[PDB]
Amino acid sequence: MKLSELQSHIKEFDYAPEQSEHYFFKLIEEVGELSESIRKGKSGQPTLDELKGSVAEELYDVLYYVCALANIHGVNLEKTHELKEVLNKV
Amino acid sequence: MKLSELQSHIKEFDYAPEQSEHYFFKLIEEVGELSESIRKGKSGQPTLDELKGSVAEELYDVLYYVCALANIHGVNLEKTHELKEVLNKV
């Protein structure tokens, strides 16, 4: 799973650039749920029936909105990653 | 950039499992910095000199701590992505 493929797969199915607030609201919701999963100690790599409410799920759900926000804000995350590599060597 | 490779690269240069709070704190810091960037409308794909403060950089920095929390919490994001695919299709 390439990171630019994740971003574009998410763009294929969930892209409403006139609803930028929707996506920011959702990011913050998922970070709240993540806080809860970490507080409860729901760590490790869940099977399918362990997934709901796990640190793993909430980590992914935050990632989803990172990517969804990137599409909305015209951000290429893979190209941004690369520029950060340049900064981190200089 | 493969997602597993990103997670694995971050773990090479930043992995302290006895400091789980460090990483959660840092996540919240970046989300606050991301919020500033969206508020200030610093959208688009920046060149190297436009990178500091950009929506692009803050989304990346948030991505970074999602991955680094995944490493700390024993989460495989790519495996978790696959599982979420299954639940979403149902």
Add this chain to the structure above:
Amino acid sequence: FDYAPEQSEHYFFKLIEEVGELSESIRKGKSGQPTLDELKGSVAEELYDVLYYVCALANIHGVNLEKTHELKEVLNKV
């Protein structure tokens, strides 16, 4: 609690949880002053819940919110 960092870490988790629930309630437009039967999930409840953990964190971190407000007011006029 009695070990201070565990208390702080708890209230900080809860702070982020409520800020999440507040985001949802703003998204859904659950504004105004609710009666009791509309309290759950309202913006009002979530704003109170966030306020609650702010205050809880101030107690544990040795913060006087009222004296902090006054210090901020000097900086403001300055």
Add this chain to the structure above:
Amino acid sequence: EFDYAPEQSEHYFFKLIEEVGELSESIRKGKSGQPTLDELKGSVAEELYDVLYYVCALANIHGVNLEKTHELKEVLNKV
């Protein structure tokens, strides 16, 4: 200062999150206690107040009475 209310709410919500980010930093760094004026910048005290400030600003624009809400919550908890 703001005339269209969703725009005022959106601003205050962005600022609230910004301030929560800054509070996270002040806690990570252990900047606890009650500071004098020279120690206020970047302290836990400052960020707590700053978060408190936007909670209130957001309550004003959403038509929330925090005193009455607190009272309603107390009735619930007792139940």
